A paper describes a structure:
To overcome this, podophages encode a large protein complex (ejectosome) packaged inside the viral capsid and correspondingly ejected during infection to form a transient channel that spans the periplasmic space.
An adaptor assembly (gp52) interfaces with the portal and six tail fibers (trimeric gp47), each of which appears composed of long helical bundles much like phage T7, as well as adapts trimers of spike protein (gp39) which may be homologous to those in phage P22, another podophage, and 9NA, a siphovirus. The [name] portal complex that sits in the locally C5 MCP environment results in a symmetrically incompatible interface that is best characterized by C1 symmetry. In our 3D classifications, we also identified two populations of particles in which ejectosome structures were aligned, but portal density was also rotated by ∼6° about the Z axis. This suggests that the ΦM1 portal may also exist as two discrete particle populations. Reconstruction of capsid dimers to low resolution reveals a probable interface forming between opposite and opposed adaptor proteins. Inspection of the dimer interface between symmetrized adaptor models auto-fit into the map suggested that this oligomerization likely forms due to formation of a putative reciprocal salt bridge network, forming between residues Arg25 and Asp23 of each chain of gp52. This hypothesis is tentative given the poor map resolution.
Author numbering:
A (entry chain B), B (entry chain A): 7 to 349, 359 to 484
Write the structure that this text describes.
């Protein structure tokens, strides 16, 4: 009876309010799937297209910053406890730094298989306009899909923890498993049948757990029970702005509804004036001597008798109004521009920082709510054994995010500077025997923020080098 | 009776609505083939030509970005499972990297044989204007063809999976096989006869399958049964924008119909004024002393008696209206410009990124829906055995797309930078024996994102080099 839960957990007020926001920017992203059965039903548009362009540009731009195509978007600290991390893979105490880097480098490419990038862009659009999205990642094939709030509903506490979810989907009988298709032997046409999925949180001895099950419209279960640890669950609900106490988030467009509402009416008035500007009439002045028939029926080049100014073109003075309205609309549009950001790894650094400045602190929220689970899922896909050992014991991987994934990104810059300075300081002091070069080295290296333990040689290596002479 | 299915699967509303979009941009691309039998039937044009220029420019530009002429448009990851991939070709563990690169480099040239590029451009036009296209690739010869929704119809579930298709085509009796031409012995003229093809999805033990069959108008089958795995099917339906629940997609032009509709009327009014500006009349003022006969019939150079201002040229004041209308039309046209993008491998990178920014996230959709099957088809054409082994077992090739085919494109840039930095850091630290050069190497290389396993020498090679002394 998952239909009962699905209906119970909905919020009609938010669904009804979020129609205008879509109507002002991109109506086709928020279309109701329950009013159509495979045929077009018309969708109306608005008198202005500024919102569409702004939203398209911002959604396209956000994808490049969050998911760069030539470097990983997450880093592993590993400073917590190297013992267990090294014991899981079975490597030396120092080879962990190389192994983690190899895993991170080889893992992030998996996000570009089987059209995931397009779904990511669609999810960004959904988050910007409606502020809610559910993301499903299939490990067997490598494909993803994004859903709107018209196909799912969630339940959470006052503290924000998600407790339950239900998802609706439509299909046909031919797609069902052989076990369940023995029933419904009649009516084996391409008739549509609904399917429901439920995700529920539960706790076992070694931690919390998510349980997945499925059911048809008429109560019948379909087995397929699966259990995942909370860290590697394939379902990811996300929010843009979440007011404490509520269940669903809010979008960026909701903060700027007044300007769009004030712009649509001006656009309508401009359209009315432009349509009025298409009257082509010629007026014959009354009280003037003219020969209308000859003027209107003679071939070009003839001579006629009458005043050379007895006929004039219709004039209403509506051009100045168009000129005036255009300037006001342009001024409002320009004033709205900054809010929507309309205009080597360091380039990505600066772009992300400027996105932080423009958005106001949501880039960090998006990074926090998306980067953490995807990293675990991809790492599990690339190496099952290593993650299985970590989850069974209870401890979990540490990941850095929030414009802070520069752990292995821009350390070479801090080494180049040290090398440049060491080439200027050491040539001097070579003659003076009172200054120890080792202390200068140990001061300069630590000054720039480099852990000397990853560069200095061990005692055994020095002894071997001295012996090899 | 494939005619019944063909008629059943059509959507008349979309077909009737999509006429205006073609009429505003390029009427000849959407002409009905069932109203003509080999003779011209006139096609009407519109008062404005902005849409035609914009569509031509965008369609021409899109082809260069998607299908560059001097590098492959797809890359193979191979990180999934090198065991089976190496076992299929019969190569070593490390020679796979070279073999895959060779295959990718030698495969992509096949797209330029026998006039495929023109069909690709036509398909891009069709996608932009109507948002639907069916693409057929013939392996025997190397030619392609593109069809509009006036010649085919498709069926899909609520989830978007395509289940069935039907295609219509016209020909003559002389083209039929000898087996079927024994019938229809009479009427062996060049009379036109229709032909129908059906593509249906079905599942067998080792995966899903597509079945192709043909039939004439009068029920008679023509044999030619063929079976393809779903991955290497030669038919590819595509969409530009697909609203969940519906069957056919939507085009880019549909988002900007209001501006074009508002522009056509202004163009008509401008044409009316321009036609009015062709009245050449001379008016003889009433109440003035003049000698009209002498003025109008004497040779040039004569002297006449009369006022020097008794005759004036006709004046209606319609020039200012032309000046005004031109500015408004130009302003609207300029405002429409950005939406249609009107204005070394890195150049292609930047061009594709800017296309991503302008379009709003469709470049990725087009790449996802076109690159994946064409890669498999071309690879099968260049090497049948390798693909046959992979498909029989069940596993499939992994391909990267969505402005993410840079796997083997721009790795040399990340190596040049490392080489430049290594030439500045290693000259220093040569005197200090406390810093190990190997650790600096292993840090700098991994910092830029290079898998050291493809550069470092193995233990055996080092031993051999040491012995060779």
């Amino acid at each position: 009876t998952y239909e009962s839960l699905y209906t119970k957990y909905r919020d009609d007020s938010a669904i009804l309010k979020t129609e205008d926001y879509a109507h002002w920017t991109l109506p086709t992203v928020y279309a109701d799937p329950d009013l159509r059965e495979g045929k077009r039903v018309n969708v109306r548009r608005d008198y202005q297209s500024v919102g569409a362009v702004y939203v398209n540009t911002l959604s396209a731009k956000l994808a490049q910053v969050l998911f760069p195509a030539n470097q990983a978007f997450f880093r592993i600290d590993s400073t917590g406890d190297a013992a267990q991390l090294a014991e899981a893979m079975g490597a030396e105490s120092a080879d962990l730094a190389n192994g983690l880097a190899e895993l991170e480098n080889t893992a992030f490419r998996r996000i570009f298989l089987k059209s995931s990038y397009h779904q990511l862009v669609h999810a960004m659009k959904l988050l910007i306009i409606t502020g809610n999205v559910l993301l499903y990642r299939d490990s067997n094939t490598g494909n993803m899909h994004a859903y709107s709030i018209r196909q799912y509903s969630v339940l959470r506490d006052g503290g924000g923890k998600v407790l339950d979810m239900v998802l609706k989907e439509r299909t046909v009988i031919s797609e069902l498993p052989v076990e369940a298709r023995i029933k419904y032997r009649n009516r084996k046409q391409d008739d549509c049948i609904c399917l429901y999925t439920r995700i529920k949180r539960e706790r076992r001895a070694v931690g919390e757990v998510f349980v997945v099950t499925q059911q048809l419209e008429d109560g019948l279960m379909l087995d397929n029970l699966e259990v995942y640890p909370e860290a590697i669950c394939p379902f990811i609900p996300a929010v843009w702005n979440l007011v404490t106490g509520e269940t669903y988030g809010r979008g960026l467009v909701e903060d700027y509804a007044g300007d769009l509402a004030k712009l649509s009416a001006l656009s309508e008035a401009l359209a009315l004036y432009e349509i009025e500007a298409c009257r082509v009439l010629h007026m014959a002045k009354p009280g003037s001597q003219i020969d209308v028939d000859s003027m209107a029926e003679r071939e070009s080049g003839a001579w006629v008798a009458g005043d050379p100014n007895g006929v004039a073109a219709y004039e209403a003075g509506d051009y100045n109004k168009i000129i005036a309205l255009t300037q006001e609309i342009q001024s409002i549009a320009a004033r709205l521009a900054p809010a929507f950001m309309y205009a080597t790894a360091e380039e990505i650094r600066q772009n992300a920082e400027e996105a932080e400045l423009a958005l106001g602190g949501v880039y960090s929220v998006i990074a926090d709510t998306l980067h953490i689970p995807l990293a675990h899922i991809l790492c599990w896909e690339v190496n099952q054994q290593f993650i299985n050992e970590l989850l069974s014991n209870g401890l979990t991987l540490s990941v850095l995010t929030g414009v802070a994934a520069l752990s292995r990104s821009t350390d070479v810059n801090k080494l180049i500077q040290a090398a440049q300075s060491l080439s200027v300081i050491l040539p001097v002091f070579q003659n003076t025997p009172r200054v120890d070069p080792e202390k200068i080295l140990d001061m300069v290296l630590t000054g720039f923020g480099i852990n000397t333990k990853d560069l200095y040689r061990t005692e055994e290596q020095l002894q071997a080098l001295q012996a090899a002479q």
